[PDB]
Design a protein around this ligand. Sequence first.
Ligand SMILES: *[C@@H]1O[C@H](CO)[C@@H](O[C@@H]2O[C@H](CO)[C@@H](O)[C@H](O)[C@H]2NC(C)=O)[C@H](O)[C@H]1NC(C)=O
Ligand SMILES: *[C@@H]1O[C@H](CO)[C@@H](O[C@@H]2O[C@H](CO)[C@@H](O)[C@H](O)[C@H]2NC(C)=O)[C@H](O)[C@H]1NC(C)=O
Ligand SMILES: *[C@@H]1O[C@H](CO)[C@@H](O[C@@H]2O[C@H](CO)[C@@H](O)[C@H](O)[C@H]2NC(C)=O)[C@H](O)[C@H]1NC(C)=O
Ligand SMILES: *[C@@H]1O[C@H](CO)[C@@H](O[C@@H]2O[C@H](CO)[C@@H](O)[C@H](O)[C@H]2NC(C)=O)[C@H](O)[C@H]1NC(C)=O
Ligand SMILES: *[C@@H]1O[C@H](CO)[C@@H](O[C@@H]2O[C@H](CO)[C@@H](O)[C@H](O)[C@H]2NC(C)=O)[C@H](O)[C@H]1NC(C)=O
Ligand SMILES: *[C@@H]1O[C@H](CO)[C@@H](O[C@@H]2O[C@H](CO)[C@@H](O)[C@H](O)[C@H]2NC(C)=O)[C@H](O)[C@H]1NC(C)=O
Ligand SMILES: *[C@@H]1O[C@H](CO)[C@@H](O[C@@H]2O[C@H](CO)[C@@H](O)[C@H](O)[C@H]2NC(C)=O)[C@H](O)[C@H]1NC(C)=O
Ligand SMILES: *[C@@H]1O[C@H](CO)[C@@H](O)[C@H](O)[C@H]1NC(C)=O
Ligand SMILES: *[C@@H]1O[C@H](CO)[C@@H](O)[C@H](O)[C@H]1NC(C)=O
Ligand SMILES: *[C@@H]1O[C@H](CO)[C@@H](O)[C@H](O)[C@H]1NC(C)=O
Ligand SMILES: *[C@@H]1O[C@H](CO)[C@@H](O)[C@H](O)[C@H]1NC(C)=O
Ligand SMILES: *[C@@H]1O[C@H](CO)[C@@H](O)[C@H](O)[C@H]1NC(C)=O
Ligand SMILES: *[C@@H]1O[C@H](CO)[C@@H](O)[C@H](O)[C@H]1NC(C)=O
Ligand SMILES: *[C@@H]1O[C@H](CO)[C@@H](O)[C@H](O)[C@H]1NC(C)=O
Ligand SMILES: *[C@@H]1O[C@H](CO)[C@@H](O)[C@H](O)[C@H]1NC(C)=O
Lengths: 592, 327, 184, 48
Amino acid sequence: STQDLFLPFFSNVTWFHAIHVDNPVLPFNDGVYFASTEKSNIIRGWIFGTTLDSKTQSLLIVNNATNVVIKVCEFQFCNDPFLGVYSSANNCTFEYVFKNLREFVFKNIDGYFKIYSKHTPINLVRDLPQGFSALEPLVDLPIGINITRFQTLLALHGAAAYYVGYLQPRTFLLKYNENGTITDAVDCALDPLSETKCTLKSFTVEKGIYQTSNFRVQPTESIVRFPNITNLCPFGEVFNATRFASVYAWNRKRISNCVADYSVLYNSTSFSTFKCYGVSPTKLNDLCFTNVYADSFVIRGDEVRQIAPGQTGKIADYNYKLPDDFTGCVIAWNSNNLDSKVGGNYNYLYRLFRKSNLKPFERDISTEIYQAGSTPCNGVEGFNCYFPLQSYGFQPTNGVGYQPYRVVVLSFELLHAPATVCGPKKSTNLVKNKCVNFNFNGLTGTGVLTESNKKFLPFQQFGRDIADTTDAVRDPQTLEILDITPCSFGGVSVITPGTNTSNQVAVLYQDVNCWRVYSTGSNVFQTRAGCLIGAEHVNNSYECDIPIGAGICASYQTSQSIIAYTMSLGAENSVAYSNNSIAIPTNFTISV
Amino acid sequence: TTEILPVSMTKTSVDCTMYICGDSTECSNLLLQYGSFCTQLNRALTGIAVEQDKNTQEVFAQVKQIYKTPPIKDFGGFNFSQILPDPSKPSKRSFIEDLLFNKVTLKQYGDCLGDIAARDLICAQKFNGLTVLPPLLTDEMIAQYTSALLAGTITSGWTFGAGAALQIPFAMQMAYRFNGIGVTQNVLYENQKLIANQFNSAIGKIQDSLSSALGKLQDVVNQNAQALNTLVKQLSSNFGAISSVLNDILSRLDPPEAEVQIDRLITGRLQSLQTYVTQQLIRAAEIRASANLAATKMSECVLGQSKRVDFCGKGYHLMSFPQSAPH
Amino acid sequence: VKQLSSNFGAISSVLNDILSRLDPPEAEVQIDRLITGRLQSLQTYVTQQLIRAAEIRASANLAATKMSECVLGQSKRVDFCGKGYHLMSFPQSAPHGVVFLHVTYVPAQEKNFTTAPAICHDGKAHFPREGVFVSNGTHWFVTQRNFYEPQIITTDNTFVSGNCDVVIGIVNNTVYDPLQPELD
Amino acid sequence: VKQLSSNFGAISSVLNDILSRLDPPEAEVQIDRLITGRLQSLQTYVTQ
Ligand SMILES: *[C@@H]1O[C@H](CO)[C@@H](O[C@@H]2O[C@H](CO)[C@@H](O)[C@H](O)[C@H]2NC(C)=O)[C@H](O)[C@H]1NC(C)=O
Ligand SMILES: *[C@@H]1O[C@H](CO)[C@@H](O[C@@H]2O[C@H](CO)[C@@H](O)[C@H](O)[C@H]2NC(C)=O)[C@H](O)[C@H]1NC(C)=O
Ligand SMILES: *[C@@H]1O[C@H](CO)[C@@H](O[C@@H]2O[C@H](CO)[C@@H](O)[C@H](O)[C@H]2NC(C)=O)[C@H](O)[C@H]1NC(C)=O
Ligand SMILES: *[C@@H]1O[C@H](CO)[C@@H](O[C@@H]2O[C@H](CO)[C@@H](O)[C@H](O)[C@H]2NC(C)=O)[C@H](O)[C@H]1NC(C)=O
Ligand SMILES: *[C@@H]1O[C@H](CO)[C@@H](O[C@@H]2O[C@H](CO)[C@@H](O)[C@H](O)[C@H]2NC(C)=O)[C@H](O)[C@H]1NC(C)=O
Ligand SMILES: *[C@@H]1O[C@H](CO)[C@@H](O[C@@H]2O[C@H](CO)[C@@H](O)[C@H](O)[C@H]2NC(C)=O)[C@H](O)[C@H]1NC(C)=O
Ligand SMILES: *[C@@H]1O[C@H](CO)[C@@H](O[C@@H]2O[C@H](CO)[C@@H](O)[C@H](O)[C@H]2NC(C)=O)[C@H](O)[C@H]1NC(C)=O
Ligand SMILES: *[C@@H]1O[C@H](CO)[C@@H](O)[C@H](O)[C@H]1NC(C)=O
Ligand SMILES: *[C@@H]1O[C@H](CO)[C@@H](O)[C@H](O)[C@H]1NC(C)=O
Ligand SMILES: *[C@@H]1O[C@H](CO)[C@@H](O)[C@H](O)[C@H]1NC(C)=O
Ligand SMILES: *[C@@H]1O[C@H](CO)[C@@H](O)[C@H](O)[C@H]1NC(C)=O
Ligand SMILES: *[C@@H]1O[C@H](CO)[C@@H](O)[C@H](O)[C@H]1NC(C)=O
Ligand SMILES: *[C@@H]1O[C@H](CO)[C@@H](O)[C@H](O)[C@H]1NC(C)=O
Ligand SMILES: *[C@@H]1O[C@H](CO)[C@@H](O)[C@H](O)[C@H]1NC(C)=O
Ligand SMILES: *[C@@H]1O[C@H](CO)[C@@H](O)[C@H](O)[C@H]1NC(C)=O
């Protein structure tokens, strides 16, 4: 078994001709299956790209009469390219120099353009043929471009026909013979029958009834609902303040009602340190933030490693302490140009002495003459009686370890309470009664939204059930409560007479009253076991062949078809009872 | 006197992916590494489910001739009206079976949408892949089987269990059974009215004691329900992860860091399913022993007269009558 | 054997692949995941083997009871040793099991008779010793219940108890009394 | 009683040894390993 991008079985491919008596621009969705039926070498290559007009980069794979040419350049392709392609080819990064069934598969993953292929002899006139043949790896090109469209390159003066299909992520069950070749496959998501084949891990199914999987619905739309925020967050009086605080009397600032679009700092501010706890830096753009605070101070360069959870040292013991469970980011940058003076800058201060370590987010500003030993000080500052604070000497000619650094600590909460910061992301309309992917204040999921009678108190945003999953939400725009429901529900079973006998099957939907069915067909029959589709109902009563349930059984009878009936319990005979009448046996039987 | 026996239990099936991942595609791609375990669990559950139908078949479907009781009820003064089927109720059940069925208390997607979900326990189960399968024989078929057994015993004695039913007057059969406990026939024939009156009064006492008992049959229902609800409740365990909610982890964390948390949750939920399946196996073995005992009692107390002490009641056994009860 | 290809949340399911490309301190965590998974697999196997062994043990106890009561004797409990009145059984060995051949007696061809509980001869009530009273239509005989072998009602064949005023369906007939001819 | 000396892939099988020498955020992962192992032992006992 393997899960990958395959062409689904029995799909619907597009067909193109070159018949005297077609080279359009096509999409390249997730990879292409390309088949070609030829006798005279008409199909000569392809061009892959996005715009194909020299503003972006394109890939040319061509077979000219003598060579195979693979180029990645900025081409001005012709509107109608052929052989008997382009005009410009300026900045080139990569360069390299019906009787036939030429099958190719094209993929584009992580900067690699992957090609598989196989050639087959055929003898036909039209229509893509039947059969099975696995393609083998051909080449893997490191091009590093964004392909979205493609166009076929043909030749001019001849009979040719080419077919295009699109790949999807599927699970397949492949079969390897004793020589190592793939001779057969099962598409595990085509049919319920195929699903039982996939589960039993065999190509043969015996007669019976099998549970397959609950009925699943895929979402159609995606929606985003963030609050109405217009202002940008104050990155300019946080990261670009003229004077910072000393680490012992560190500063704390509230932040609210602003969009957190930090891409404005890309040109503004180069950071030597930027580390986030409890969140991935790649999710910041999709989240909304609760109780945001910013802490600011200035330290020596050597001491920056101490602004982290569970650290020791004088900064982390007497000046500034982080919690063990911290959510937020630490940001630090060198500030020698701003905070160093040629004589020496003594404005910035720290605590060198404290009886005990600080608690998390506790500030100490007390200037009490520290008593080292015995013999109390009476606040006079002498032997074993020291001024508690000390200053940093910042000069332009310090070593990098001794230079000043500006530090900002951002503290926030995620996905529990109503939020007001909410990074950059555009909101859509609210759509109801459909299975839809959704994002509410950064919380993502899938399901169906309905109007709710629940009344939330003003300080709450989400509602959770016994299993702890979120089932209600206040809309951040209209302030209305909405219920969330899963869109996958209901049991399914498949009835087969045996794959040896036939491929015809019946399907039972256990939670449908006959529509949440895979196909309607005909012969829709309702039982207390559910809705049965694909079986003819008869008024007889036989012995049970295949049990369906609630007294209903099924069989494969005579033209052959699946029939569903009510099982008979046996023959009915009444005893001839009277009050003066007996029955005596006259012979016997010996039975083994 | 009355004896109560459990014969079958609830049949259940699990959608493994529905329970472990919900509708998360990433969790399903991660879970593809554990498919053998889900297939193994489902194999064990399907074995249990077919065994339940085999139990019911072995207890109730011994004889394949569906006898009918005679229209003329001349049984020497014995009145079996309380255990014979009432031909006017929708279900063709006897009066006592109707009383018994009222003493044990045992769904479309649109029916539970929104509020109703997570409040009603059955829908909470069904949104997490836990389904209950219906039995093969309905209540009406089992009632038909019991009525056939009763008609056979009161019209033909014990002959219908060895071959073809041979009719005999009911008093002469009673005299035969008196011979089988060591009492001569004339005792029955002389005391026939007293014996019939005592039998009728005793049946009345049974009836009046039921409309006022079935704990052995209610605890099976309670145990199955409690196990399914415990599985639904165990979905709020972190198992040492940041949260127990997949959607909360998938936002705020990228795939390489979300994978370790998802892996913890997957291991925990597979362990929960495994524990459920093991305890279901042990319970099914106990129900199977009980159903074998019920089949032996049906053969030896209803289809014959038993001489082994205390197998068919307290005292010298004369005859037995079966009635169907839920499970 | 098939469950050895599970990663259990490790980089690979192959130990040799992990041991190359990783040093002991980083290989230990992956190996630990694999060890936990494979111990769980062995545990599941052993538990299901225990439950299956209990079922086989119940079956073997039943087989021993059948051997004692059907082969080493004649059983009167209904349907334990076949369908019908049990006569005898023969065991045969089978791979992992036993097969029993039960020889039983089955009543074959039935005929209808009118019957009666007692006979009233001279103000006395006569009951069968070990049979049943039947009539072919015109005449009265006594027979045995499981095979039809009619006989003349005599005093060495019935027993008397009481008069004829209490038994519900008594009939009038003569009882031979096979001594009177000899005394004469 | 004897199965209480298994590490289950942790630094030690003794809780007091882990609680000294390690802070709560780093002690939690080791304690979690021990908890999972000891719950599995109790489960096996109850099944048998
Ligand atoms: C097919 O393409 C190849 C490569 O673009 C052509 O080969 C080049 O031809 C030019 C013109 O003579 C030479 O200057 C290059 O050195 C050749 N490159 C090679 C040989 O690698 C080839 O001529 C083309 N064939 C046709 C029929 O046009
Ligand atoms: C892509 O091509 C353009 C166009 O030639 C390049 O831009 C010119 O490159 C030359 C080569 O040094 C310079 O003299 C010009 O000043 C550039 N600008 C213009 C407007 O002509 C560009 O460098 C190429 N890009 C890459 C990545 O190779
Ligand atoms: C918070 O303040 C209390 C009281 O000032 C501190 O506790 C005292 O600590 C001194 C030694 O530093 C002891 O002599 C006192 O007996 C303590 N009193 C009480 C009531 O606990 C405590 O250390 C301070 N906490 C921090 C983190 O500075
Ligand atoms: C009792 O039954 C046996 C068979 O079970 C009868 O024997 C058969 O008789 C027919 C003709 O009457 C023959 O064609 C068969 O070959 C006989 N079978 C055997 C095994 O011998 C027997 O006749 C019956 N007796 C009575 C009195 O009905
Ligand atoms: C057999 O028993 C039934 C029920 O005990 C008797 O039917 C009842 O008869 C009384 C009159 O004595 C009525 O008041 C009840 O309503 C009857 N109940 C039902 C359910 O019919 C019946 O009479 C008894 N005897 C016979 C010959 O049937
Ligand atoms: C009932 O059995 C009696 C007694 O065997 C039958 O009467 C006998 O009939 C045979 C045949 O005609 C005679 O040879 C005997 O002499 C008769 N015996 C007596 C005592 O009369 C009688 O035929 C049978 N009745 C029916 C209806 O079958
Ligand atoms: C059996 O015989 C007794 C007496 O031998 C019959 O009882 C007498 O029957 C006649 C006519 O039916 C009555 O007039 C007498 O009063 C009855 N009692 C006596 C004589 O004590 C009895 O009826 C017979 N049974 C039948 C013929 O079925
Ligand atoms: C496998 O290889 C052998 C030896 O070359 C060959 O004879 C056979 O046809 C091949 N195919 C199969 C299916 O065995
Ligand atoms: C980035 O900043 C530099 C220095 O202020 C400026 O010269 C440049 O134009 C800026 N780039 C843009 C357009 O953001
Ligand atoms: C920071 O403030 C100074 C003061 O004039 C300004 O020149 C600089 O461009 C600012 N940087 C920003 C806003 O990123
Ligand atoms: C936000 O926008 C919506 C729609 O534009 C509007 O109904 C609502 O009043 C606005 N304000 C708040 C606080 O939701
Ligand atoms: C299906 O719905 C119909 C229409 O309401 C109803 O009569 C019937 O009871 C339902 N079927 C079952 C099996 O409950
Ligand atoms: C089955 O019986 C019903 C009602 O008796 C009747 O309407 C239906 O047509 C019958 N079906 C067949 C195939 O005869
Ligand atoms: C006995 O008599 C009843 C009454 O009609 C009849 O139906 C039955 O077939 C008879 N049995 C035999 C064996 O003749
Ligand atoms: C048998 O029933 C008839 C009426 O059908 C009755 O006259 C006769 O007395 C009854 N016999 C017995 C023994 O009850």
